[PDB]
Amino acid sequence: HMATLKVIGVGGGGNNAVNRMIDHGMNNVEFIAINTDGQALNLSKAESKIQIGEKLTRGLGAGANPEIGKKAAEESREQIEDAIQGADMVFVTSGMGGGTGTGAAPVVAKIAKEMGALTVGVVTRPFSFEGRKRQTQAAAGVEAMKAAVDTLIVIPNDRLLDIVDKSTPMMEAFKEADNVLRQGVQGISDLIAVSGEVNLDFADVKTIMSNQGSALMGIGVSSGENRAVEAAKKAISSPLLETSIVGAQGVLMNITGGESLSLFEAQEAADIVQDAADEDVNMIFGTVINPELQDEIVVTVIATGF
Ligand SMILES: C[C@@H](Oc1ccc(F)c(C(N)=O)c1F)c1nc(-c2ccc(C(F)(F)F)cc2)c(Br)o1
Ligand SMILES: Nc1nc2c(ncn2[C@@H]2O[C@H](COP(=O)(O)OP(=O)(O)O)[C@@H](O)[C@H]2O)c(=O)[nH]1
Ligand SMILES: [Ca+2]
């Protein structure tokens, strides 16, 4: 078994995220670009492009109307089905609060779910500076997404205002939000490709992520003294995500280190994650020894079930 991964951008923000992943290059991942706006879609370098709702919008965007996004996706349901064929895991990325993403992303997610793919949404909420209407439309989108996916990761754009200085370019801030999806997809790619000393596979991912709701995901990297505790604390901190680890009922956790990775430090790291989660957490723990590493360790966590 080698899980087929597809990453689907829906609407402007979603396609912005996909374009940055295409720019980096991600081997053994299929990228799909979905939009109402034909002009925007023509500029995408995704190898699979679906212009949705041409009869409805005449090739324009949805004008921030989620009903138009929804009806566009429904018009083009068969083309979406065709593009998703063969997927074992689908990431649907979209900015909530507009028209295309808000309306179409839940339709796309439900199609993926009903084809049997493990369906993960990674979505943003609008900045408060965009106003109450955008925020209310986005909230309805988030709820529709939660109903349609297996697991949802939500990034409030306001959290970007906590990690910038007064001069940080807008595009640099956007790259930070993008990195959540990109590093997530990279983690799954590594999990499916590499054989761990304590091995985790795609069935473990499904146990933790299938038919859940909101999730915390994070990665922590440290070296030197107290590296295990530091990396584990960083992994569970995830300042861009609205979901916290507190009370998590399911956890998939991996530790990657060099030959020096000690049993004592593995316990330290796992205890940090455990102490935060629910008393009866279903925790699946993995370990990889990468001999090319020296003093670095990397802790990766996804936490579900709240
Ligand atoms: C770092 C990677 O895990 C591994 C990589 C490489 C491996 F060899 C092994 C292993 N122990 O077999 C392993 F668990 C990983 N990826 C993830 C992960 C990544 C992304 C998500 C998602 F889908 F975005 F939410 C969920 C989980 C986790 Br927890 O751990
Ligand atoms: N973080 C981030 N948020 C974005 C980006 N583009 C758009 N957004 C957010 O996504 C929301 C919807 O915009 P957009 O996706 O362009 O609308 P749609 O094409 O109608 O789905 C906006 O209100 C913003 O909050 C982006 O590149 N990065
Ligand atoms: Ca593995």
Residue numbers in the entry: 10 to 315
Show sentences the authors wrote.
The filamentous temperature-sensitive Z (FtsZ) protein has been identified as a promising new target for the development of novel antibiotics. FtsZ has several properties that make it an appealing antibacterial drug target. It is an essential protein required for bacterial division. FtsZ also has no functional human homolog, offering the potential to target this protein specifically and with minimal toxicity. It is one of the most abundant and highly conserved cytoskeleton proteins among eubacteria, offering FtsZ inhibitors the potential for broad-spectrum antibacterial activity. Lastly, FtsZ is a “druggable” target whose function can be disrupted by small molecule targeting of a single site on the protein.
The only difference between the two compounds is the presence of a methyl group on the linker connecting the oxazole and difluorobenzamide rings of 2 that is absent in 1. This difference makes 2 a chiral molecule, while 1 is achiral. A racemic mixture of the R and S enantiomeric forms of 2 was dissolved in DMSO and introduced into crystals of SaFtsZ12–316 by soaking. The structure of the R enantiomer of 2 [(R)-2] in complex with SaFtsZ12–316 was determined at 1.4 Å resolution. An extra electron density was clearly observed in the cleft between the N- and C-terminus domains, which enabled us to determine the position and orientation of (R)-2 with an occupancy of 1.0. We have previously reported the structure of 1 in complex with SaFtsZ12–31621. (R)-2 binds the same protein cleft as 1 in a similar orientation to that observed in the structure of the 1-SaFtsZ12–316 complex (see the overlay of 1 and (R)-2 depicted in Fig. 1c). Note that no SaFtsZ complexes were observed with the S enantiomer of 2, suggesting that SaFtsZ is selective for the R over the S enantiomer.
